[model samples]
Target chain A: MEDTPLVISKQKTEVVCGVPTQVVCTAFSSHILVVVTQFGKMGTLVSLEPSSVASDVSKPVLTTKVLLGQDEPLIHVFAKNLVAFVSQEAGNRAVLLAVAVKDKSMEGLKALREVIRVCQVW
Target chain B: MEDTPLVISKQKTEVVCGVPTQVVCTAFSSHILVVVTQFGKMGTLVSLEPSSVASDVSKPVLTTKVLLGQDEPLIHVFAKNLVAFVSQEAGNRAVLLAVAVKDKSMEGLKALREVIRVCQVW
Candidate 1:
């Protein structure tokens, strides 16, 4: 009930795919919240977690689910593609990502990931 | 898809009901995100919106739903009581509130709401 706050946060704005992309990262004790927007909205909220069971070799598969927004199949892929490495690098911490990018090009996604890496909160 | 970013944000930490309460308000184009936490974690996530039909004559009744947390009956009431005014004051914008409070007293709620008023992002 009483403890010092541990909410780490960082934000950065950069142009990606000719669109102004804004990224905000907030790391909490239980979860990490990341917001990537090109439309100035909160966008789609996707929660990603590492499953206990490994895929084949040793890497764990990431579970992606849309907590808020359209439940499209592509969004799950987009969410994983955008922040899969983030979850792993953050010591398997679950990430709540709000992504709203207009461009889905590989180049654009790479650029967005780089921007997120720059605005790392974990 | 392209517009000026309207993500206004404000945060403040204050002691409420003998607990350190943190309030963060972020305004976006279509929704408002408010986080009121006594626990450092992002507690219950609730989405509140104004109903189309007016309750009595002019005021619209609020619709509350839990998006990413426990679905308790009390939580719905708590969600509305916390941010009903926020949505109305923000011109009926949808509000996504992540609240995790330790105290639910009338006085505590008043104090918390006043603190939220001070951290107005809209």
Candidate 2:
């Protein structure tokens, strides 16, 4: 067989909320790996999965759970807020996110999402 | 503070066992993310962690667990064979591996390890 593109990845470094931030997105066959960091650490690892039982046909809901790192309510909130569109766009493939941020303010989260969007590989 | 490097990553695509294989390694603060694929899909997600309990002071033992995808004896063996050194080298930091392979022969596995070593970022 020919050389197949096994994985597709896109990454960028930008300023988010005045903090130099970086985002890396990798598209796997079964998963989308997204890393957003300002601390240069893989802060928290969250797996956002679309429930098989969809409450609505058009809208698929994501269940966020921390697989590695602290499980906090805000992490789930931020995860859903940031990459909900990614799962929707990738045919509901599970998304694995490693997020570390120094700024959690509304503006920071919004800008971070924009950064992720710009670096979307899925 | 000066702009810190949020992450360090190295990746390569090469012919392994005469099959075009791709490997991507990303160094995170808490984890090293490695993706090896020949099927163009993130085959399975495995986390290799060094246990705090020291079987031996100098030699650290790795605990392999399948967090996603199929769980099999061979997977654990492969995980250890490929990335056991990564956690040891990274100060016992956990390693997250996404592996998909078309060849499972002994020669292929050895070649794959060499590929990973070439793309080491941690």
DockQ for every model comes to 0.46, 0.55
Give lDDT tens digits, candidate 1, residues A47-122.
8988767566454788888888899999899889889888878877788888887768889999999998998877
iRMS for all predictions?
Answer: 4.5, 3.2
Clashing residue pairs for model 1: none
Candidate 2: the clashing residue pairs are A6-B40
Residue B13 in candidate 1 has what lDDT? 82
Assess every candidate by TM-score. 0.90, 0.90
- TM-score of the A-chain for all models: 0.89, 0.90
What stretches of model 1 exceed 4 Å from their correct place?
A1-6, A53-58, B1-3, B53-57
For all candidates in order, state the fraction of native interface contacts they contain: 0.47, 0.61
Which docking class does model 1 fall in? acceptable
How well does candidate 1 score on lDDT at residue B24?
84
lDDT of 2 by residue, A48-99 (tens): 9887776685657888888777887998999998889889888778899889
